[PDB]
Design a protein around this ligand. Sequence first.
Ligand SMILES: *[C@@H]1O[C@H](CO)[C@@H](O[C@@H]2O[C@H](CO)[C@@H](O[C@@H]3O[C@H](CO)[C@@H](O)[C@H](O)[C@@H]3O)[C@H](O)[C@H]2NC(C)=O)[C@H](O)[C@H]1NC(C)=O
Ligand SMILES: *[C@@H]1O[C@H](CO)[C@@H](O[C@@H]2O[C@H](CO)[C@@H](O)[C@H](O)[C@H]2NC(C)=O)[C@H](O)[C@H]1NC(C)=O
Ligand SMILES: *[C@@H]1O[C@H](CO)[C@@H](O)[C@H](O)[C@H]1NC(C)=O
Ligand SMILES: *[C@@H]1O[C@H](CO)[C@@H](O)[C@H](O)[C@H]1NC(C)=O
Ligand SMILES: [Ca+2]
Ligand SMILES: [Ca+2]
Ligand SMILES: [Ca+2]
Ligand SMILES: [Ca+2]
Ligand SMILES: [Ca+2]
Ligand SMILES: [Ca+2]
Ligand SMILES: [Ca+2]
Ligand SMILES: [Ca+2]
Ligand SMILES: [Ca+2]
Ligand SMILES: [Ca+2]
Ligand SMILES: [Ca+2]
Ligand SMILES: [Ca+2]
Ligand SMILES: [Ca+2]
Ligand SMILES: [Ca+2]
Ligand SMILES: [Ca+2]
Ligand SMILES: [Ca+2]
Ligand SMILES: [Ca+2]
Ligand SMILES: [Ca+2]
Ligand SMILES: [Ca+2]
Ligand SMILES: [Ca+2]
Ligand SMILES: [Ca+2]
Ligand SMILES: [Ca+2]
Ligand SMILES: [Ca+2]
Ligand SMILES: [Ca+2]
Ligand SMILES: [Ca+2]
Ligand SMILES: [Ca+2]
Ligand SMILES: [Ca+2]
Ligand SMILES: [Ca+2]
Ligand SMILES: [Ca+2]
Ligand SMILES: [Ca+2]
Length: 621
Amino acid sequence: DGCLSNPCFPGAQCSSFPDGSWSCGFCPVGFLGNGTHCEDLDECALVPDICFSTSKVPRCVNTQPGFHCLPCPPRYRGNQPVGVGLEAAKTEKQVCEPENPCKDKTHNCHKHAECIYLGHFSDPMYKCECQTGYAGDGLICGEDSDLDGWPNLNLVCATNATYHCIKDNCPHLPNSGQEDFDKDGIGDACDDDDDNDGVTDEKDNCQLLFNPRQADYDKDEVGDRCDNCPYVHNPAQIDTDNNGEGDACSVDIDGDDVFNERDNCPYVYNTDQRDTDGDGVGDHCDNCPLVHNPDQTDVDNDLVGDQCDNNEDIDDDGHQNNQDNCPYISNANQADHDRDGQGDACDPDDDNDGVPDDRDNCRLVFNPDQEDLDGDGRGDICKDDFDNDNIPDIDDVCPENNAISETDFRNFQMVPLDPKGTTQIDPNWVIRHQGKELVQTANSDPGIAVGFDEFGSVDFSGTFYVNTDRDDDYAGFVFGYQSSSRFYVVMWKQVTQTYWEDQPTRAYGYSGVSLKVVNSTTGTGEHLRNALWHTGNTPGQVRTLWHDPRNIGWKDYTAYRWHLTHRPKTGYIRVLVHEGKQVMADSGPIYDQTYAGGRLGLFVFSQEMVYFSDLKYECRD
Ligand SMILES: *[C@@H]1O[C@H](CO)[C@@H](O[C@@H]2O[C@H](CO)[C@@H](O[C@@H]3O[C@H](CO)[C@@H](O)[C@H](O)[C@@H]3O)[C@H](O)[C@H]2NC(C)=O)[C@H](O)[C@H]1NC(C)=O
Ligand SMILES: *[C@@H]1O[C@H](CO)[C@@H](O[C@@H]2O[C@H](CO)[C@@H](O)[C@H](O)[C@H]2NC(C)=O)[C@H](O)[C@H]1NC(C)=O
Ligand SMILES: *[C@@H]1O[C@H](CO)[C@@H](O)[C@H](O)[C@H]1NC(C)=O
Ligand SMILES: *[C@@H]1O[C@H](CO)[C@@H](O)[C@H](O)[C@H]1NC(C)=O
Ligand SMILES: [Ca+2]
Ligand SMILES: [Ca+2]
Ligand SMILES: [Ca+2]
Ligand SMILES: [Ca+2]
Ligand SMILES: [Ca+2]
Ligand SMILES: [Ca+2]
Ligand SMILES: [Ca+2]
Ligand SMILES: [Ca+2]
Ligand SMILES: [Ca+2]
Ligand SMILES: [Ca+2]
Ligand SMILES: [Ca+2]
Ligand SMILES: [Ca+2]
Ligand SMILES: [Ca+2]
Ligand SMILES: [Ca+2]
Ligand SMILES: [Ca+2]
Ligand SMILES: [Ca+2]
Ligand SMILES: [Ca+2]
Ligand SMILES: [Ca+2]
Ligand SMILES: [Ca+2]
Ligand SMILES: [Ca+2]
Ligand SMILES: [Ca+2]
Ligand SMILES: [Ca+2]
Ligand SMILES: [Ca+2]
Ligand SMILES: [Ca+2]
Ligand SMILES: [Ca+2]
Ligand SMILES: [Ca+2]
Ligand SMILES: [Ca+2]
Ligand SMILES: [Ca+2]
Ligand SMILES: [Ca+2]
Ligand SMILES: [Ca+2]
């Protein structure tokens, strides 16, 4: 009777008595107390912890009837708890898993592509790369028979892609820059006459310029219309400031307005001419800027002149104690993104925004308020470009380092490993593909061309191809390069040969890929020379860490691909070498903590016509 007037509340059970009175029992699932005046419950705010709190405080959503778990935020995947009431709230809990299209096989990569996980917080998280022996954009992969990253045919990405889609213009000769001067679809590298003027390039004194008459005023054998110094002998055509007028006929070769002979750094632009120590070598080119040293002698090839050079480097990252922004913790790259003098490695706040490294959703970009308005766990201020060097993550070979984004050996140090007086045959390095391909031309002394970028953890690969039948000697590459007495080297001999100098020690150089760590008590010279050639250990010189026991030599005119994995933090090293698509050498895991990082470089020891093509390095920290 009494319940007929609905004095209670929608859903709430009204109990009616014989005398007309009533009482209100339940409040319907998900509501407050008092059966008469009833209100909505917050299952979220003050009960359990139903939803997946992505390093934050939000996430669970309270509705007027019931409650709501947000869908798993980007980079994650799970279920989405929906509940009517309160006993449904302690039971049922949101599990969100960290996504990984590589391990989850949800990727869109080609059968002959590898899905590569870029790391949880990367933009994007994964990419597609064609496997060795193939080329493309990762979605489509075709045969790449010389491993120079350009496929043998035009592929169905030849319209939508920048690189690796379009007929390799020298199908059988590594030429990762695909330079084709006359544009006749035959690349410079295999083209017989590069400028289509009828003079074959071996005879042509202006190889990349049309000049059929061959006019050569001075007999420097570099013809008129390409000679940067037409009236002055200069076969190297060196042009320091790449202005079109070569050094030979320039009174100011670096274009800095201070004339040569006045210039205290004749090769390096320095209008300001500052010379702190007064030694006549300006700071910009002074390898010992604080200490008098006009001769600039640098006997161990680390860019620190003999006079500053004390080798005291207690953490083995190759920067000495007095020149190390983290003297005690290895950090070969010396990264210091906030520029406060404390290296990323020892500094607990790398951008100086108050939010410490471990708790910062944009570790390298200033953002105290940690705005992440799409919920992807990354501050929106570093959305595609973690290190803020304006190169997006996907195109950045070192996405957590603003000093490096491109594989580039365009500028390199020549490190001569056995300098002398006449037998001095220097390596000749020619650079193509904007620093991503080097060809060594000469049957030369041991020598390295080492790039200037520095690495802790690193992956480094490159195409190895010897474009001649002559000789059977060494080529390869270095990593963790610190000084000419401190590097790891991978080198590769064709035929086993004992070195033609029995002094100072007999060196027997076996065929096969050799992984070695140089730790020389003498530095450059005959002792290290021989030790480098020798397969095995040489006390006070070289220690061989691995060498292919099958002893397989490289073949003439044959494309190989090496892949170095180096993780100095543990000491992990892995060297893979590929012939075409098939692995042909694998060191397996190696462990060596002699050097906790350093630079990369290419290596020759008495082998000419060596192509180091389609070079790539990446930071893997
Ligand atoms: C990069 O550009 C190429 C340009 O060809 C893309 O390849 C093409 O991708 C489309 C998908 O957008 C395929 O179209 C499909 O065709 C059928 C009809 O045959 C249509 O019914 C489907 O709805 C679908 O759109 C197309 O077949 C494919 N071309 C081939 C044959 O390879 C490529 O997809 C682009 N990269 C990406 C993001 O996938
Ligand atoms: C490379 O070898 C050098 C010398 O062969 C090592 O330096 C010596 O280290 C030992 C400790 O085992 C000391 O007793 C010597 O005094 C050191 N020699 C000198 C004069 O420096 C060095 O440890 C090795 N480099 C590494 C592992 O980084
Ligand atoms: C009907 O509901 C009204 C509330 O407006 C209440 O005053 C009345 O007591 C109810 N009828 C009964 C129980 O006799
Ligand atoms: C229920 O809440 C209302 C709020 O106005 C109040 O008037 C009523 O007295 C409450 N019931 C109880 C416990 O007496
Ligand atoms: Ca509610
Ligand atoms: Ca190719
Ligand atoms: Ca080619
Ligand atoms: Ca051509
Ligand atoms: Ca040519
Ligand atoms: Ca031509
Ligand atoms: Ca020509
Ligand atoms: Ca010519
Ligand atoms: Ca000339
Ligand atoms: Ca000249
Ligand atoms: Ca010039
Ligand atoms: Ca000058
Ligand atoms: Ca200068
Ligand atoms: Ca000086
Ligand atoms: Ca000096
Ligand atoms: Ca030095
Ligand atoms: Ca040194
Ligand atoms: Ca150090
Ligand atoms: Ca350090
Ligand atoms: Ca710092
Ligand atoms: Ca730090
Ligand atoms: Ca700091
Ligand atoms: Ca910070
Ligand atoms: Ca930040
Ligand atoms: Ca974000
Ligand atoms: Ca970047
Ligand atoms: Ca970078
Ligand atoms: Ca040969
Ligand atoms: Ca030989
Ligand atoms: Ca030789």
